[PDB]
Write a protein that binds this ligand. Structure first.
Ligand SMILES: [Zn+2]
Lengths: 146, 210, 205, 186
């Protein structure tokens, strides 16, 4: 589904007491989109339990360059005590990545290998076209790191 | 210098960048023709004044898959006989004075699941349509601004509307008249914040724009 | 072919204190594009590091690689070029940042059909338990006890993977030959995050 | 006239002592449940004379009934609140099952005198606040859904304090409590 579709269903999901989500917003285009209100057309909350989630259980983080994404996840997996996420949505990773033939492989494999190695259900929106090289790298590393 | 970028990275709640669905007061016919139909779909704070003790035939209609929190100070709505099956009731000693009403309303906002647990709600996947506090005149004898403050935060947070009742000015004279813009004593700080005020005259209801 | 490369790498050490030349003569002819000597060069040339997150060092390397040890470590190869970033080497998943890996990884995609799955192109899956190999070289964890995975290192391999393979995918004594017996391969424990973060700072830009 | 059917607060105009005593009897003698009558009076006039006639204290069955009749006399709102405070601790204990289900009847007589006397030592602001804290408390206590302890309240006033009622068939306490506090009448 679409980013804002899976984001919507995660706040309003039923409570196991619930998911604890982290949304990683990558790229400046995506940041403008989220900060300046483009989301709130497409994601709302109605449930008491959704309202709490939208406040206490879903965390948004903005990172502007892939270098800091790598450093951030590297810091994430390095602490024993630290917030534990059941879902990690990575938004806009394809935008950052342009895009030479072998420089694209090395960056994505490093980035992809770092994300999927987290104790969460990690997902990348927008979904990259099925036949595209990032989409094929994502499937490959998912099988490897599963 | 990216070690310093990493040091200043900041976490935000989703709620900053998204809306909560608002619920609006539709009206029953009895009250309807005091405002533009465009002003009738913006209705988030209504306050009704009436001389009855039990709630009027219009107020019961304002209340009736979702749920509605009735803070019942009078101990009327929550009597076993009259409980509607769409309602959540808070009836308690701590809530008879305006300080304990706020502390609850603050608990509803700060930690809503503990609030609704104190109401025998153990399951929270539901929409809280609105809150109903009946009746305000018993609250202060000895803040009415603080109460509206927290009531607005509950409307932004949970998207519910607000309905309030208070007695007309005859109640505030007292027993044997010993206690002596709007025909009730609610300070205009509170009364301002209300989208629509309604007076009940004996068998008719009329708005107050003063 | 028919070989178990894992045991064959154990045949480079006898114990002693220099590499058995019979075996090293064989291993040379088994890898293309000069892979075995550069793997061996790197091993003696003190550009190999193994960083750990923090009872003995040699013991916890033994525990992880030679046998429920979940250890946070890093296999780095520092570049003499010096205006060049470090080299991150993952033998568990068979991946390296080096230009050599990423060229033939790319070539593997150009030889491919773009509707083929990478897993098919780059990995030998064996699900018939009777064909299970004791070879640990270029082995991946399938996340199944019903299967065995091996990367096709004929299709993609680099001098730093073979290198660390020789170190960590053969006998303990080949491990001790390069670490406790000599330091041709450095092993540094690291007790603080800021230092851990600082190893990674130029791997991406 | 029976406990299951009482409203949380009920006003009784000028009660006929025959119907009062026949009402205490009809209930306090109910079986399987221990029902008590707390009679709180400003003037100290319980209909004792006619009561002994109906429920003779020598008959062995009636001994349990006087066991459940608590006469008390308090002169002002201040002591009325301490009676209701005790009444809350009685109901708290019996809610723990720490039994036969309790049923209390609070019967207050000439409350407007108890208001009056308080209205000297205290201000009318304080007085209405006291009256308020108590009646709203009693209404919550009565509305409580635990059935191992119940309470019902009855306020008897002489019908000429209720003058405003008989029309629809100053503002007096009995009148002011009729519109703003009690559930039903008679
Ligand atoms: Zn390499």
């Amino acid at each position: 589904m679409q980013f804002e579709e899976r984001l919507q269903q995660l706040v309003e999901s039923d409570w196991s007491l619930s998911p604890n989500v982290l949304v990683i917003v990558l790229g400046d285009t995506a940041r403008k989109y989220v900060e300046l209100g483009g989301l709130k057309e497409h994601v709302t909350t109605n449930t008491v339990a959704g309202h709490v989630a939208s406040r206490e259980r879903v965390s948004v983080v903005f990172l502007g360059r892939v270098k800091y994404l790598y450093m951030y996840l590297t810091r994430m997996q390095a602490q024993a005590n630290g917030p534990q996420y059941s879902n990690v949505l990575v938004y806009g990773l394809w935008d950052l990545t342009a895009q030479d033939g072998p420089q694209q492989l090395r960056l994505l494999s490093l980035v992809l290998r770092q994300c999927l190695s987290l104790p969460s259900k990690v997902e990348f929106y927008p979904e990259p076209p099925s036949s595209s090289v990032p989409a094929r790298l994502l499937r490959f590393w998912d099988h490897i790191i599963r | 210098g990216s070690m310093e970028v990493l040091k200043n990275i900041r976490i935000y709640p989703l709620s900053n960048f998204i809306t909560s669905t608002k619920n609006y007061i539709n009206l029953p016919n009895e009250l309807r023709n005091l405002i533009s139909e465009e002003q009738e779909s913006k209705l988030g704070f209504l306050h009704i004044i009436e001389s009855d003790f039990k709630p009027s035939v219009a107020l019961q209609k304002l209340v009736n898959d979702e749920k509605i929190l009735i803070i019942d100070i009078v101990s009327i709505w929550s009597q076993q006989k009259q409980r509607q099956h769409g309602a959540i009731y808070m009836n308690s000693l701590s809530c008879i004075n305006i300080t304990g009403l706020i502390v609850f309303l603050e608990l509803l906002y700060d930690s809503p699941m503990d609030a609704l647990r104190r109401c025998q709600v153990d399951n929270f996947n539901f929409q809280l349509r609105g809150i109903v506090i009946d009746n305000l005149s018993f609250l202060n004898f000895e803040k009415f601004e603080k109460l509206f403050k927290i009531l607005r935060k509950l409307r932004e947070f949970l998207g519910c509307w607000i309905i309030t009742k208070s007695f007309p000015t005859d109640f505030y004279n007292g027993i044997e008249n010993t206690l002596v813009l709007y025909p009730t004593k609610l300070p205009d700080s509170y009364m301002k914040g209300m989208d629509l005020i309604i007076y009940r005259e004996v068998p008719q209801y009329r708005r107050i724009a003063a | 072919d028919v070989i178990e490369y894992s045991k064959l790498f154990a045949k480079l050490v006898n114990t002693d204190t220099k590499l058995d030349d019979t075996i090293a003569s064989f291993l040379y002819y088994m890898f293309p594009r000069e892979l075995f000597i550069r793997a061996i060069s790197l091993l003696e040339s003190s550009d190999m590091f193994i960083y750990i997150l923090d009872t003995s060092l040699i013991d916890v390397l033994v525990d992880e690689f030679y046998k429920n040890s979940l250890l946070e470590y890093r296999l780095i190869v520092k570049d003499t070029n010096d205006g060049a970033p470090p080299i991150l080497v993952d033998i568990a998943h068979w991946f390296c940042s080096c230009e050599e890996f990423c060229k033939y990884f790319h070539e593997a995609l150009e030889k491919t059909d773009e509707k083929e799955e990478l897993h098919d192109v780059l990995i030998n899956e064996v699900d018939d338990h009777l064909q299970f190999s004791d070879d640990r070289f270029a082995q991946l964890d399938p996340h199944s006890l019903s299967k065995q995975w091996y990367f096709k290192f004929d299709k993609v391999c680099c001098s730093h993977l073979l290198a660390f393979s020789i170190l960590l995918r053969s006998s303990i004594n080949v491990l001790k030959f390069f670490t406790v017996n000599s330091n041709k391969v450095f092993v540094i424990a690291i007790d603080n995050i800021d230092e851990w973060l600082n190893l990674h700072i130029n791997i991406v830009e | 006239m029976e406990y299951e059917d009482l409203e949380l607060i009920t006003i009784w105009p000028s009660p006929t002592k025959n119907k009062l005593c026949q009402f205490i009897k009809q209930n306090l003698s109910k079986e399987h449940v221990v029902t008590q009558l707390f009679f709180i009076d400003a003037t100290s006039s319980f209909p004792l004379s006619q009561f002994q006639k109906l429920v003779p204290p020598t008959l062995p069955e009636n001994v349990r009934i006087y066991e459940n009749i608590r006469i008390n006399t308090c002169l002002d709102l201040e002591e009325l609140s301490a009676i209701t405070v005790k009444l809350l601790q009685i109901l708290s204990m019996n809610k723990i099952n720490a039994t036969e289900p309790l049923k209390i009847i609070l019967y207050i007589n000439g409350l407007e005198v108890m208001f009056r006397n308080s209205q000297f030592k205290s201000s009318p602001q304080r007085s209405h606040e006291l009256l308020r804290d108590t009646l709203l408390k009693l209404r919550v206590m009565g509305n409580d859904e635990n059935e191992n302890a119940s309470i019902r309240t009855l306020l008897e006033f002489p019908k000429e304090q209720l003058l405003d009622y008989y029309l629809k068939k100053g503002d007096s306490l009995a009148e002011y409590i009729w519109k703003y506090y009690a559930d039903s009448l008679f």
